[PDB]
From Swiss-Prot:
Belongs to the photoactive yellow protein family. This is Photoactive yellow protein. One of its GO terms (biological process) is regulation of DNA-templated transcription. Photoactive blue light protein. Probably functions as a photoreceptor for a negative phototaxis response.
């Protein structure tokens, strides 16, 4: 395992050192998005939660293509305000229900330490 707790205050500094292989050792799902919502990184734990194959969703748009259930003011709306503002740090519960059994999760969205990238972290509840 990589030992990093979900919700940790300095998580963006810790994850700045990991490559795709290290990200697969986290105890929670991790997605890195660009400012348009395209998927740059997608770890093994996220694929275990949602059924998606990580290598197949990299490059797709999360809000348009992969996760239309998140295209709502409650999820995408928060993301886009964060990108526009250049700051984002929010945690909320959500249900993922597209082409899968409805699954309740906790989501943490946080701006990355690098400029135009954003993390989405997911764990079951
Ligand atoms: C709603 O459409 C949610 C879909 C979804 C969430 C998270 C993922 O990693 C993949 C699909």
């Amino acid at each position: 395992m990589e030992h990093v707790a979900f919700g940790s205050e300095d998580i963006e500094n810790t994850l700045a050192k990991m490559d795709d292989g290290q990200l697969d050792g986290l105890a929670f799902g991790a997605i890195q998005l660009d400012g348009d919502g395209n998927i740059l990184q997608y770890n093994a734990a996220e694929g275990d939660i949602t059924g998606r194959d990580p290598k197949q969703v990299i490059g797709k748009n999360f809000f348009k293509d992969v996760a239309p259930c998140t295209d709502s003011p409650e999820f995408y709306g928060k993301f886009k305000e964060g990108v526009a503002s250049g700051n984002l740090n929010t945690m909320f519960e959500y249900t993922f229900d597209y082409q899968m059994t409805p699954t309740k999760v906790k989501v943490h969205m946080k701006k990355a330490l690098s400029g135009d990238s954003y993390w989405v972290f997911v764990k079951r509840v």
